[PDB]
Structure 1
């Protein structure tokens, strides 16, 4: 009966039927985005109203629509025509991926460029790359993809080994026209293959790895009810899935004695951007919003047992809409398991003679997605001791270019003639906070050093300070690792037994934020990425740090627009947006396929509990 249950195939089919009946889903219409909406605030009292949000594209050139449907009542709640030049283009459609290569294949400028390089058009793959917003006035209001070319020598070849540098094309994917072909000159196409399953490159496979078997002979310690409600070691939550955000966690709460205590109302990765740092005109426009432009959830992998996820795994198989509104299942798209996590607590006491050891565990909820060359794993962890953690795992194949003769300040060499432009992968976690309920505030906590003198004669004292963020205008914060800066979310109306407000402390990794010049297109479009932490007052339409329509959308929406409202956030329903990312100067070791690298953040209880919450964990 949960209003947070996953969308069923039946609900998606019903949205399709409702849209059809209403005249909104004729033969030229395509669903670019479809997702369930969360229940409104205080709606637990009322009966269920399952609502779905839909972005509908029109392949005949007509304007797209944003539509909200009540699947419960069989009605269209709202439907509005979008002016994309103003508010943004809809997300890239999967069916458009192939169109760039297809159109370019009969374009005389493209063919001339390929001929200059002695490349067979039949062997030239073209990546369908988001366009962003630059100096090309004709693109405003048009659905444009840009194309970069890679040679594929045979069907099983890794085309990433063979970038065609000095060449880029721009394509209007609706009118099916090539708007521009830019050829700045030939570069050698790197010749070495990158086929990581070819025995010639791998050499003889290791025979040294003996098996590791992870089993749970009594099954797992968590239960799943209502399709997606998890209960595990005092934790309770609902595992949602959205085609844009991927796995979304709802109603994270911890059962402390008798009382179910909320911690986080909703946790998601609300955006992720991959800005490239190569000033070549062939690539200087490249910034991929995997979440906002491409919808990462939709490309979630089916995860194979004992391979992607090891141990006793329980899977969810989320259902999404295809381009026509038919349900499609992502089989085994979400892994859920618990795993051992080393020592939890240990003390061997001389005076009492008592030796004590307890083991830790974490609940793991994950998925893995692929967009082009990139593959990302998104992992949420809940620990016995109350810690909540997110980790992103980045792998795949590095996006390549030529490596310039005589080197580059903005590109790494991976193989002879083969380059990897510098880039970042930057995430925004949106944490709709509910520390013991919705009345929350955030404080920035810094370590405070003290001077040797009166009151500190030996010069050993140190302290800390906390600054409450009272209004949104003062809640745009940067990291300070040197001073141990963290942020505490607390509930000023809920005190622990020591009469202190209950709280959770956010620990960041303090990685560099967005490096681009502040006057760049990307600094405006990914404004969120320029600062480590933002706090907003909750609003049901403030979902993404980049706004609803990111594709070919200038600044104007998202977090900078939300915080201009300068709302009170001191003991209110608030949302924390944490920016965190990797800055990648590719190494030779990343080629021809990249070993996982990670980034993340965690939140630990900070006087939330009245003592350790893991005193009741048993021995052995």
Structure 2
């Protein structure tokens, strides 16, 4: 059995049984996170030990625990009681989504605010929102959620159309108390609906779209073995799934002749945060760590054939744990298919008379998740020519507010009285590199402009310079789009046939990084988001750029603390963390449901191969 196989239902049940037998999973306990751990370096031969890590919440007020179990051996490896005021609260539990609204519905201050606005409490939905860390001392060590109100005129109404501005509440979800209700003033509740399946708003549906049929009459060119091992057009990898990160790729390698050459040991989106830029106190605290606080894998959609995934689709249905340790399958949660990708290479040569055209293809591994109003697709692509790409597709319904009478520098108007606060969606890709194996380094490569003069008399020359990042203290880097800045991951001990180090070049989109003031809470809690590229020395406990417990965790842990170790990264087992985000000034076209917009990055081979790796692609 591959140590990188997906968790099975039975493994989850065994975790549940081990915890129960150990006294760690009584009736007051709730699992907030559960996932398999990756194999240790050098374990491959042989003795598998499948370990699972668990964060256990306690609804009676006792301290939560972090536990690692061996499902192979039926044992508890470690169990530690957590002090959440110090190391952070556990991820938000799905069962807490409804608690915020329920507690507020009987609170006299909340009821007073709603009555002043002539809103029926039974129609008022409350978004259960992560709290962060601000000035409220009573929240330290307590599990808090904040609530913003949205009116549903009827049960199938889009409540996002009807934000209740001027009002926010804070709730202790363990003691089941409402800590604060803040009402700064009434705002009109926007009147128009945003019901994008209502014929009155859509108009007559188009009849002009003729069908498109994508089929594979001999089936797909990729095979799946061992549950999640992919072989496709010389690529080899394993598709993992973690309730926090979502789809994870392991052991990305390329068969070059008859050697299996590693490229990336683990690829994931290790954090994704949505900071808001509206200074109103109703929302200025708002920063949604979709990955670290809510767990994006947990909310993966079941993807329907034809509608969500077009073509010849192979599905994985990953297993996660519910809050009690029972396995739950996410049916059709991962889509895998191969797609045509236009022209790969083409040349019509006058002198030889030979005309040559070849087509490209990509392997696609994706999932789609829903976090409140947001919906995101996470796509990994592998191309015939060795390129690796990630793309996020952001859609859903924009988070709304009132639109202030005199306008706003921090909010867009979408409809009469309806606003959408400015925000960013910022991702961290954690790429545990293995370029031709684990001995790797990173160089920053800039274009170099040259002055007209001796040695360059016509002023045409230009060049490039590479700077080796030798230690972690030197490996916090920013974009420089103007100088074409990229980062090359190479293996200094593996040379191609031209005696040059094999490598892969990371091409970033160079979008803005975190805009918040450097002194803000979010700049400290999401320090990773302030820089485009970080390199660390591999360490099995350094998994997320924000640390293990992001919820209400005050700042510092994660990448800035890892980097302080100032470890050697010059020909060592290293990890690249790439920050990339979308800055979203909402547009009217984003309302009532937003068209997809994208952000991502790609890596291309750079002297990894001895010549083009796609010379053996056939015509047709």
TM-score normalized with structure 1 length:
1.00
Partner of residue 480, structure 1: 480
Superposed CA deviations along residues 440-498 of structure 1, whole A, max 9, x for unmatched, are 00000000000000000000000000000000000000000000000000000000000
Q: Distance in 1 between matches of 2:458 and 2:25?
A: 76
Q: Distance in 2 between matches of 1:40 and 1:88?
A: 26
Matches of 2:406 and 2:454, distance apart in 1: 61
- Is 1:260 aligned with 2:260? yes
Q: Which residue of 1 aligns with 2:177?
A: 177
Residue equivalent to 1:153 = 153
Q: CA separation in 1, counterparts of 2:569 and 2:69? A: 32
Distance 1:557 1:465 in 2: 33
| 2: CA distance, partners of 1:414 / 1:152 | 18
Q: Provide the rounded CA distance (Å) in 2 between the counterparts of 1:89 and 1:245.
A: 18
Q: How far did residue 406 of structure 1 move?
A: 1.2
CA distance in 2, matches of 1:306, 1:397: 23
Residue-by-residue CA offset, 1:41-94 (whole Å, 9 max, x unaligned): 000123110000000000000000000000000000000000000000000000
Structure 1 distance, partners of 2:350, 2:563, is 55
**Partner Cα separation in structure 2 for residue 309 and residue 513 of structure 1:** 32
Deviation per CA, 1:532-567: give whole Å up to 9, x if none: 000000000000000000000011310000000000
> For structure 2, which runs of at least 5 residues remain unmatched after alignment?
none
SS of 2:270's partner is strand
Counterpart residue number, 2:76: 76
How far apart are residue 17 of structure 1 and its match? 0.5
User: 1:292-322 deviations in whole A, cap 9, x for unaligned?
Assistant: 0000000000000011000000000000000
How far residue 102 of structure 1 moved from its aligned partner, in angstroms, is 0.1
Question: Distance in 2 between the 1:361 and 1:387 partners?
Answer: 11
1:256-312 per-residue CA deviation (whole Å, 9 max, x = no partner) reads 001000000000000000000000000000000000000000000000001100000
Q: Unmatched 5+ residue regions in structure 1? A: none
Between the aligned partners of 1:14 and 1:225, the Cα distance in structure 2 is: 24
Secondary structure class of the residue paired with 1:13:
helix
Q: Can you list the C-alpha shifts for 1:102-154, whole angstroms capped at 9, x where unaligned?
A: 00000000000000000000000000000000000000000000000000000
- Number of matched pairs: 620
Match in the other structure for 2:226: 226
Q: Secondary structure, in 3 states, of the residue corresponding to 1:435? A: coil
SS at match of 2:14: helix
- Alignment partner, residue 505 of structure 1: 505
Q: Tell me the residue number matched to 1:367.
A: 367
SS at match of 1:534: strand
The 3-state SS of whatever aligns with 2:482 is helix
User: Shift of residue 435 of structure 1?
Assistant: 0.1
Structure 1: 4+ residue segments shifted above 6 A: none
Structure 2: distance between partners of 1:430 and 1:317: 24
CA–CA distance in 2 between the matches of 1:63 and 1:211?
Answer: 57
Return the alpha-carbon distance in structure 1 between the equivalents of residues 179 and 87 of structure 2.
Answer: 22
Secondary structure of 1:451 counterpart:
coil
1: distance between equivalents of 2:552 and 2:428? Answer: 19
SS of residue matched to 1:617: coil
CA displacement, residues 170-194 of structure 1 (integer Å, 9 cap, x when unaligned) = 0000000000000000000000000
Q: Distance in 2 between matches of 1:556 and 1:593?
A: 36
Return 486-495 or 43-52, whichever deviates more: 43-52
1:117-516 equivalence runs, <5 A: 117-516=117-516
In the alignment, the residues of structure 2 paired with residue 535 and residue 281 of structure 1 have an alpha-carbon distance, to the nearest angstrom, of 36
The whole-number CA distance in structure 2 between the counterparts of 1:393 and 1:617 is 30
Mapped partners of 1:187, 1:613: distance in 2: 62
What SS does structure 2 have at the residue aligned with 1:360? Answer: strand
Match of 1:552 in 2: 552
How many angstroms apart in 2 are the aligned matches of 1:452 and 1:480?
Answer: 23
Q: What does the per-residue CA deviation read over 1:383-432, in whole Å, with 9 as the maximum and x for residues that have no partner?
A: 00000000000000000000000100000000000000000000000000
Equivalent position SS for 2:166: strand
